[PDB]
A paper describes a structure:
NALCN channel is a voltage-modulated sodium-selective ion channel. It mediates sodium leak currents that are essential for setting the membrane excitability. Sequence analysis shows NALCN protein shares a similar domain arrangement to the pore subunit of eukaryotic voltage-gated sodium channels NaV or calcium channels CaV. In addition to the NALCN subunit, FAM155, UNC79, and UNC80 subunits are indispensable for the function of NALCN channel.
Here, we describe the structure of rat NALCN and mouse FAM155A in detergent to the resolution of 2.7 Å, which provides enhanced details and additional structural insights into the mechanism of this important channel complex. We prepared the NALCN–FAM155A complex in a buffer with sodium chloride and GDN detergent, mimicking the symmetric sodium solution used in electrophysiology recording. The map quality was sufficient for modeling the stable portions of NALCN and FAM155A which encompass 73% of NALCN and 37% of FAM155A. Interestingly, the arrangements of VS are highly asymmetric, with the voltage sensor of domain I (DI-VS) being the most off-axis. On the extracellular side, the CRD of FAM155A protrudes from the top of the complex into the extracellular space while the two predicted transmembrane helices of FAM155A were invisible, probably due to their flexibility. The CRD of FAM155A binds at the top of the NALCN channel. Extracellular loops of domain I, III, and IV (L5I, L5III, L5IV, and L6IV) in NALCN form a platform for FAM155A binding. Unexpectedly, we found the 1387–1390 region of domain IV has two possible alternative conformations, both of which were modeled in the allowed region in the Ramachandran plot validated by Phenix29. Therefore, the arrangement of charged residues at the HFS layer of NALCN selectivity filter (EEK_, − − + 0) is similar to NaV (DEKA, − − + 0) but different from CaV (EEEE, − − − − ), providing a plausible explanation of the sodium selectivity of NALCN. The gate is tightly sealed by several hydrophobic residues on S6 helices, indicating the current structure represents a non-conductive state.
Residue numbers in the entry:
A (entry chain A): 31 to 95, 105 to 336, 374 to 616, 751 to 765, 843 to 858, 873 to 1578
B (entry chain B): 188 to 200, 226 to 262, 267 to 389
Write the structure that this text describes.
């Protein structure tokens, strides 16, 4: 009675939160900064140690000494241990910088007690555990798949690259003596061979930096030294982290094609597809939750207040207020910003809205006011802004209230409000996920804090704010490897593997589960409710026996003819080629050819090879303009210009065609010899760069892609408005609190703006990663520069435009950590909250809304948006059975002892598991680079010879034991034969030639066998099919993304071809040719600092030399051009069009990956039916007669069992179904399989209304005729 | 009327004909009209006409010149180790950068007005020239996060870099 009260449990929960807070303050640095806190936290500990001890003895005295009680007792134990340890620490006995504080590691777990009440759901615990087991098995499978790809690319990186140890240094660098002052600026890699990589210029030599005394500890952790380093590097790259500069090193050290192929395929497979498979898994988890939840069951002042004119006036006042507050831009170091006219405007608006709230209260009473749940937010704003206007909380955290008033503006658009209610759903799915995310972040920060607060020279976990910033940064992925690297260096060499496992596991969970849950929650909010889907449709033992029982208990004239002929001309064993050749009219085929040739020509245009001065580049231009003039004239004469239903201008595509034609015609007629920067001629060249967009109109698959993408533009635009509103809120706040406060002296030893003059010796960046800390008595490279009081040049909050640009750059999470650090170091640490909140609201939620709306519109275009999850699973099963074929296993021979025993040997699961282990082991043989001057490569190649001889005997066994004819039946067997023949070829060459290309061929054969490993595992094969079939299904989407990228690449060669080298524009990334521009634009969406590149391309005087005549002589950048170009490209590609790849991966995952459900025909059932059909169909026809059907049905065992003890009626129904289907003959393995699938599900759930009525009519007819024949057998006797 | 590089304070002690060794665009006539090292600060050109004080000021000029030379050697050492020196700009080469940087540094050490210049330019403008012709050199980012700042910049937050009372020295470009 003393512990079951209502208030006591709330007390225990609040005290669990308080204990979390207590342990989050218990670090040595926190006690150095605030000594009182020490005793404070002790007291709290003691107090809680009392109370919880009570709730243990006051409870385990009732019951004799729920599986929460053991947890609560371990918590009490942790509290007691922390108490006695802190008593020892108070008495100065323990150092407090010793690892004893690690005993407080479990204490944060007490936070679970504060939320344990919210662990009661509407589903029984059995259904919850079934959901969790299904999701766990799927996550295990996808993790195995991920590990397969990681090992594949790790071996490829070991063999295609090596160590990046050759650097350009000054030639007078003696061995053993290299210093910071011998390297180049910036540090650059090179190749010692005259044909690969970067060649050092005169004055520099390419040295090894390993014969020179440098250690692989002061040279990084990345690279491809051995298989472990390489796997870690591949995993880092799959997060789009640090792979671009690794690629730059590879390009400088090795041939270029290697790096391009390697890293582009790594980003495409690992960073896009394999990553999207995890999102598919979480979306399937939510689909399974749905399936489980479904199968479980004044007299006049009031009138003027009610008028819409008053609402319009108040919303206009909110608009004016927030616009005026946002427009308080920085005006210089000689103004006040404290009691100025903006403050008086703020006072006036605060008084106005306080009067509005008072009036609403005085009209509707108080309780009727406050019940509105929107008047609650308005009263919160009234109070917060009134406190804000008090002239000591002006321009403080209280400003958050003022800038929040823009939320009221959501009531101008009913559609935006409905979209908000739709996409954010209930405050119990998304809100619960946000609370779980905050709690997980707090607990992991507290745990990492207790792990690392004592470690010397590690300022990432000294206090809870720092530990939380570190864990949040790992969540956002921006520089997470840097956090882990600093920690790994700090902890030492013995514990580094354990903390590396910790950080990798945390990153894996965070980025592959938490963010995927955000996506899945948004998608579930956008997906119609199951009951609503069924209601909207209405407005318009063995599983066979279970379904049978359910089914039972339920019972003028001329020259237009010639033009029309020419523009409509078009155009079976091989009908695929004939459909490819008749895809478009001959006129469109010619025009596609001419478009492609013109784009290929434009790929040679550069600032120094111009189309206006080079005739070979004008060939394609003249051809394009002439042929498009002919095409337009023909189509306009034939199909009319505007009026005709198939006129030329009837959609946006024809308008764009006319636009492109006119641009190219004006350019070719003009052909200006001088093109000034930012002129109309350069704008004309940029518009001419839009020529690839004609492929989007001439190819119907591209038209389909564009049409389906723009079918969801309303939702895309509403998400854009929500993100703009968020950025406006935070940009107004940033202008009010940060304007003029981000500047400081570029000399770190200066503090006051009055001391910031003269010159100082600045240190220049040599190597960001390399750690040649060795400096005997010399200083770091640098030189003398003026002291300047400057903004960071990449972002400021001085006006609302700069603030919105900075927040848009932070939204991409690229370089956001530098913004965070600048705001915390130059304004104050309290203003870290600001940036973090934005990063949580804009990236984890904001961009996830784009992901969700794009996937939802995709699913709506393919038609599956109004189907229930059971109906969608039925469609996926019906597609899975439409491609299943009879099994490829010929029978075992009779009394052929040389083949029967060999049959039992090759078909025994021990043999297959042994072959898979051998594939993995030969794969492991490629762990060190197979060189030709390395000794270990000879043992490795000899063992590879042993392996390929083993696989030779395996293949000969499977060919003689099975058949030479039947061995060729399996495609996997054919691949294995191909790889084994390549293997024996390599063996005879390797012992004959023994060259370096011999080792290359051996490594290649090993890689192809490793790739064979994917056919020896069910889940691996299903996931590989998912990936490759979704890559096939995304061909035209990838073509469209490439077409957009090509347009942008041409435009960027025109705009940024000669931009002065800057922070990120350099010899590795620039727009000096179309190929360089293409590679740069690819890297800009897959893990490079695109905003740094944007700010390099915005360079203006006095940082460049303008030219008044031509752009190729001007060295400068386009400011507005760079803004529009980079922002629009990043939005279009990274936020919109890659989510199409996500949508396709999700579709194909639900199609190909099958789990053994209870109420559906599964993969094992398909295999069992295949075995039974193999035994019934003798000569392997794939088609049996009618009586073999009853034989097969009697034969089926397991889950397809039809036992003649309780389900004889079912047997007769199925046999008569197979009789009736073709008037009595020759069913075809899909008739019987379709019959099984139908008789194996509850058709009321799985089928749609048309198919349901058809099937129920069919089954009623069958049952009636079976009853008729039974009655006739009776009347016969 | 040709130049006369200064070598000894005593030997040279028509001042518009004696140029400094490294900062070879400043005559002694111009230095005595404005420059004065504070320790020996008595040289307002009234120490040459009316000579130990002169030796003290000319040796101060030579020390200024020598320190400017050391700093310039550090700069050209950085510029030598810059490998993209031939690619960074279609308009500027390392020699242009070197010349304008030497002019800027020499103006930092001798903040005086130059006379008898064919073409004249505000001396502060040489700062801007270093921003224009020299390559972007990323500064090291351990103590302070520079953002996207370059190593050499001239004008701060909300400042008109060119103002009144400028030395307005020669133009050598
Ligand atoms: C990027 C946005 C991510 C920010 C997430 C913030 C958040 O979640 O707060 C949610 C608030 O969401 C909002 O952003 C509402 C505020 C929108 C302000 C609209 C400003 C009006 C601008 C005029 C637009 C012109 C309309 C033109 C359209 C044709 C709260 O969720 P809820 O309303 O309670 O719904 C759940 C029901 N229990
Ligand atoms: C930072 C704060 C963010 C909160 C802002 C979100 C607004 C709504 C808050 C979310 C919310 O209240 O959801 C409620 C609370 O959310 C949760 O369930 C908590 C999530 C579990 C966190 C577990 C923490 C331990 C994890 C570390 C290991 C959901 O409960 P309910 O369904 O409404 O009631 C069930 C009683 N039958
Ligand atoms: C890491 C975690 C280490 C220890 C976690 C402490 C778990 C406490 C176990 C208590 C327990 O077994 O609760 C049992 C069930 O346990 C639960 O369901 C736990 C509640 C879910 C909380 C969700 C927290 C998961 C957060 C994921 C963590 C991911 C971070 C990984 C980063 C490296 C209650 O079952 P019962 O005993 O049958 O209840 C009725 C009996 N009358
Ligand atoms: C690592 C990155 C992965 C690369 C992307 C994944 C590669 C996917 C693998 C193979 C692609 C297979 C292509 C799928 C074929 C789809 C079949 C189809 O629907 O098209 C059938 C015909 O096939 C076609 O549509 C051919 C496409 C028309 C011409 C293509 C024009 C695009 C031009 C490419 C851009 C050129 C660049 C410009 C020059 C630099 C339709 O037949 P129908 O009965 O007439 O209707
Ligand atoms: C968000 C950023 C998305 C970036 C996507 C950019 C794609 C390149 C611009 C597309 C120009 C190609 C125009 C193709 C086109 O006209 O698609 C037609 C209309 O598509 C559109 O609505 C696009 C209009 C806005 C595009 C900007 C599809 O109609 P249809 O298949 O021909 O059906 C005929 C009877 N109704
Ligand atoms: C809500 C946005 C209200 C626009 C505030 C305009 C205040 C303003 O003049 O910003 C000026 C610059 O800011 C802008 O250009 C406004 C751009 C607004 C874009 C966001 C929508 C500040 O003058 P400055 O710093 O001397 O150059
Ligand atoms: C490179 C990747 C090579 C793929 C090897 C593992 C493929 C296993 C798989 O996904 O399903 C298998 C797909 O089969 C294939 O198509 C393997 C591809 C080989 C094509 C023909 C072999 C000669 C040319 C290579 C199913 O095999 P089956 O049912 O016995 O007929
Ligand atoms: C996430 C999806 C929706 C988000 C919308 C993305 C675009 C909105 C985000 C940021 C736009 C910021 C507006 C740029 C104003 C720059 C502030 C400023 O004071 O610069 C001033 C601007 O002066 C100018 O001449 C720039 C005028 C060009 C305006 C360009 C704005 C369009 C940006 C295109 C973005 C399109 C996004 C993708 C939509 C498909 C001058 O400063 P200065 O240093 O003296 O030269
Ligand atoms: C609930 C509490 C916090 C509300 C506080 C409101 C008070 C403190 C605010 C509201 C109006 C404000 C005043 C408005 C007018 C002026 C005159 C001006 O020349 C200086 C500021 C000054 C003197 C303000 C002082 C602070 C002020 C009096
Ligand atoms: C079959 C027809 C329609 C296609 C060929 C069109 C002919 C007329 C086109 C194609 C290539 C064109 C040439 C391409 C290059 C040049 C160099 C330029 O400085 C003058 C025009 C000139 C000489 C063009 C003249 C017209 C031209 C010869
Ligand atoms: C290293 O280089 C410095 C600089 O020239 C030189 O003084 C020193 O003797 C060298 N030491 C060795 C071991 O080469
Ligand atoms: C280094 O290279 C420079 C320029 O080629 C040359 O003058 C110098 O003598 C070289 N020093 C060596 C080779 O030690
Ligand atoms: C440059 O690095 C040195 C270390 O050699 C350090 O002492 C100095 O403070 C740094 N200078 C600047 C301006 O960062």
């Amino acid at each position: 009675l003393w512990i079951n009260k209502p208030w006591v449990h709330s007390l225990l929960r609040i005290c669990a939160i308080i204990s979390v807070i207590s342990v989050c303050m218990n670090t040595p640095m926190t006690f150095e900064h605030y000594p009182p806190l020490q005793y404070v936290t002790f007291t709290l500990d003691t107090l809680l140690m009392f109370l919880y001890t009570a709730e243990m003895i006051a409870k385990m005295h009732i019951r004799g000494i729920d599986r929460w009680c053991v947890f609560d007792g371990f918590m009490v134990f942790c509290l007691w241990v922390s108490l006695v340890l802190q008593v020892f620490e108070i008495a100065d006995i323990v150092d407090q910088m010793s690892p004893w504080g690690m005993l407080r590691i479990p204490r944060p777990l007490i936070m679970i007690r504060a939320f344990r009440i919210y662990f009661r759901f509407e589903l029984p615990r059995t259904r919850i555990t079934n959901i969790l087991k299904r999701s766990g098995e799927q996550i295990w499978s996808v993790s195995i798949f991920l590990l397969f790809f990681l090992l594949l690319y790790g071996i490829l990186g070991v063999q295609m690259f090596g160590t990046f140890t050759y650097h350009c240094v000054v030639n007078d660098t003696k061995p053993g003596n290299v210093t910071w002052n011998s390297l180049a600026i910036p540090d650059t890699h090179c190749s010692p061979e005259l044909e690969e990589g970067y060649q050092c210029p005169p004055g520099f030599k390419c040295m090894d930096l390993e014969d020179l005394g440098l250690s692989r500890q002061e040279l990084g952790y990345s690279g491809f030294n051995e298989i472990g380093t390489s796997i870690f590097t591949v995993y880092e790259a799959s997060s789009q982290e640090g792979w671009v500069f690794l690629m730059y090193r590879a390009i400088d050290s090795f041939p270029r094609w290697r790096s391009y192929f390697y890293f582009i395929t790594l980003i495409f497979f690992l960073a896009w597809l394999v990553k999207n498979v995890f999102i598919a898994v979480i979306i399937e988890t939510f689909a399974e939750i749905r399936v489980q939840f479904q199968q479980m069951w004044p007299a006049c002042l009031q009138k003027m207040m009610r008028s819409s004119v008053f609402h319009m006036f108040i919303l206009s006042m909110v608009t004016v207020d927030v616009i005026v507050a946002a427009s308080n831009y920085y005006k210089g170091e000689n103004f006040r910003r404290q009691y100025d006219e903006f403050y008086l405007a703020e006072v006036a608006f605060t008084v106005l809205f306080d009067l509005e709230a008072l009036l609403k209260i005085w009209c509707l009473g108080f309780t009727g006011y406050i019940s509105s749940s929107l008047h609650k937010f308005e009263l919160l704003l009234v109070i917060g802004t009134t406190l804000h206007v008090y002239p000591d909380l002006y321009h403080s955290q209280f400003t958050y209230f003022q800038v929040l008033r823009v939320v009221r503006l959501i009531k101008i658009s009913p559609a935006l409000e409905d979209f908000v209610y739709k996409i954010f759903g209930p405050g119990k799915k998304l809100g619960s996920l946000v609370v779980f995310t905050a709690s997980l972040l707090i607990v992991m920060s507290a745990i990492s804090l207790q792990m690392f607060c004592f470690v010397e020279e590690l300022d990432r976990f000294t206090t809870f704010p720092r530990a939380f910033m570190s864990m949040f940064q790992i969540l956002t992925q921006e520089g997470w490897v840097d956090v882990m690297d600093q920690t790994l260096n700090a902890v030492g060499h013995m514990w580094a593997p354990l903390v590396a496992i910790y950080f990798i596991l945390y990153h894996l969970f965070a980025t592959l589960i938490l963010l995927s849950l955000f996506v899945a929650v948004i998608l579930d909010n956008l997906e119609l409710d199951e009951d609503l889907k069924k209601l909207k449709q209405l407005k318009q033992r063995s599983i066979l026996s279970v379904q049978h029982h359910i089914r039972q208990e339920r019972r003028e004239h001329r020259f237009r003819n010639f033009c029309r002929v020419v523009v409509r001309a078009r155009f079976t064993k091989y009908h695929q080629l004939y459909d490819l050749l008749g895809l478009v009219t001959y006129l469109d085929w010619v025009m596609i050819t001419v478009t492609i040739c013109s784009c290929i020509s434009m790929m040679f245009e550069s600032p120094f090879r111009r189309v206006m001065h080079a005739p070979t580049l004008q060939i394609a231009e003249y051809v394009f303009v002439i042929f498009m003039s002919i095409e337009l004239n023909l189509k306009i004469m034939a199909d009319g210009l505007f009026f005709t239903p198939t006129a030329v201008i009837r959609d946006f595509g024809g308008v764009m065609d006319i636009f492109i034609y006119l641009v190219s015609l004006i350019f070719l007629c003009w052909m200006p010899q001088n093109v000034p920067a930012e002129s109309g001629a350069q704008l004309l060249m940029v518009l001419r760069c839009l020529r690839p967009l004609r492929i989007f109109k001439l190819v119907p698959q591209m038209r389909k892609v564009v049409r389906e993408l723009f079918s969801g533009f309303k939702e895309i635009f509403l998400v854009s408005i929500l993100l703009l509103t968020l950025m406006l809120v935070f940009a107004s706040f940033g202008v009010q609190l940060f304007a003029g406060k981000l500047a400081k002296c570029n000399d770190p030893n200066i503090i006051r703006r009055e001391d910031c003059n003269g010159i100082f010796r600045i240190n220049v960046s040599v190597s960001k990663n390399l750690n040649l800390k060795l400096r005997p008595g010399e200083k770091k490279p640098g030189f003398w520069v003026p002291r300047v009081w400057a903004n960071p040049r990449n972002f400021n909050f001085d006006n609302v435009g700069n603030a919105m640009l900075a927040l848009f750059e932070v939204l991409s999470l690229k370089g956001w950590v530098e913004v965070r650090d600048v705001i915390i170091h130059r304004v104050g640490p309290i203003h870290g909250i600001y940036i973090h909140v934005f990063v949580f609201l804009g990236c984890m939620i904001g961009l996830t809304l784009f992901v969700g709306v794009v996937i939802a519109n995709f699913n709506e275009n393919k038609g599956t948006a109004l189907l229930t999850v059971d109906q969608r699973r039925w469609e996926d099963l019906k597609s899975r059975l439409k491609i299943a074929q009879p099994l490829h296993l010929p029978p075992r021979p009779d009394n052929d002892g040389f083949r029967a025993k060999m049959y039992d040997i090759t078909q025994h699961p021990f043999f297959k598991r042994t072959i898979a282990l051998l594939v993995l082991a030969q794969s492991v043989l490629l762990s060190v680079k197979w060189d030709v001057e390395d000794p270990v490569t000879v043992p490795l190649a000899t063992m590879s010879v042993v392996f390929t001889f083993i696989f030779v005997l395996e293949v000969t066994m499977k060919i003689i034991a099975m058949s030479p004819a039947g061995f060729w039946q399996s495609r996997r067997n054919r691949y294995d034969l191909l790889v084994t023949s390549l293997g024996v070829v390599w063996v005879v060459l390797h012992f004959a030639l023994l060259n370096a290309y011999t080792y290359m061929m051996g490594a290649c054969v090993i890689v192809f066998r490793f790739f064979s490993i994917c056919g020896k595992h069910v889940t691996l094969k299903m996931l590989l099919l998912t990936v490759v079939v979704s890559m096939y299904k995304s061909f035209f989407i990838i073509v469209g993304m490439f077409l957009l990228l090509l347009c942008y690449a041409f435009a960027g060669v025109v705009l940024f071809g000669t931009v002065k080298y800057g922070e990120n524009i350099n010899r590795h990334a620039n727009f000096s040719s179309a190929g360089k521009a293409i590679t740069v634009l690819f890297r800009i969406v897959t893990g490079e600092d695109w905003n740094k590149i944007m700010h390099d391309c915005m360079v203006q005087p006095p940082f460049c030399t303008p030219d008044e005549f031509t752009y190729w002589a001007t060295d400068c950048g386009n400011y507005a051009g760079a803004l529009m170009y980079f922002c629009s490209f990043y939005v279009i590609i990274a936020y919109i069009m890659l989510n199409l790849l996500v949508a396709i991966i999700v579709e194909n995952f639900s199609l190909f990956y099958s789990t053994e459900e209870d109420q559906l025909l599964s993969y094992n059932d398909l295999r069992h039916f295949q075995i039974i059909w193999n035994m019934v169909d003798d000569k392997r026809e794939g088609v049996i007669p009618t009586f073999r059907v009853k034989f097969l049905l009697r034969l089926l065992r397991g889950r397809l069992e039809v036992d003649l003890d309780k389900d004889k009626l079912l047997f007769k129904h199925m046999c008569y179904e197979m009789e009736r289907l073709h008037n009595g003959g020759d069913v075809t393995f899909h008739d019987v399989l379709s019959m099984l699938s139908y008789r194996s599900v509850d058709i009321r759930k799985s089928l749609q209304l048309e198919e349901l009525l058809a099937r129920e009519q069919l089954e009623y007819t069958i049952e009636e005729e079976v009853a008729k024949q039974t009655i006739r057998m009776w009347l016969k006797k | 009327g040709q130049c006369f590089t200064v070598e000894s304070a005593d030997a040279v002690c028509n001042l518009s004909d004696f140029y400094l060794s490294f900062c070879n665009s400043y005559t002694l006539w111009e230095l005595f009209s404005g420059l004065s090292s504070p320790s020996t600060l008595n040289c307002s050109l009234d120490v040459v006409l009316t000579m130990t004080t002169c030796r003290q000021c000319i040796e101060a000029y030579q020390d200024y010149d020598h320190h400017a030379q050391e700093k310039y050697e550090e700069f050209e050492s950085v510029l030598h180790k810059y490998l993209q020196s031939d690619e960074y700009s279609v308009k500027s080469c390392p020699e242009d950068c070197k010349i304008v940087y030497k002019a800027w540094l020499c103006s930092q050490y001798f903040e005086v007005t130059q006379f008898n210049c064919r073409k004249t330019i505000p001396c502060k403008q040489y700062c801007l020239e270093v921003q224009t012709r020299c390559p972007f050199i990323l500064p090291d980012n351990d103590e302070v996060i520079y953002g996207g700042l370059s190593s050499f910049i001239c004008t701060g937050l909300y400042e008109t870099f060119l103002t009144n009372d400028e030395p307005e020295c020669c133009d050598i470009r």
